[PDB]
Amino acid sequence: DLQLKNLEKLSQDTKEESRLNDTKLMDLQIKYENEIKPKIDKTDIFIQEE
């Protein structure tokens, strides 16, 4: 029962840390793509057109 509870807690922590890592990666990629990338675009437009 101790090992079964350990496996249950392992599965719970595994799914929790998996969703945490996934959320971190997509949120940071979203920061790159919707904040950093528009800044790249604005900087390039300012350099070229102006």
Added chain:
Amino acid sequence: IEIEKMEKKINDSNLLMKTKISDAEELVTSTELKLEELKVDLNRKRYKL
């Protein structure tokens, strides 16, 4: 590993914003200073003539 890899990616990206903005400002200032120096050189040459 993926998280840290594209974290290094975004860190390099932020360095790239900073470097690109600094380079653009520096080149604009350099062009303006070159124009002013050319103006000084040309008006001195005109006075000499």
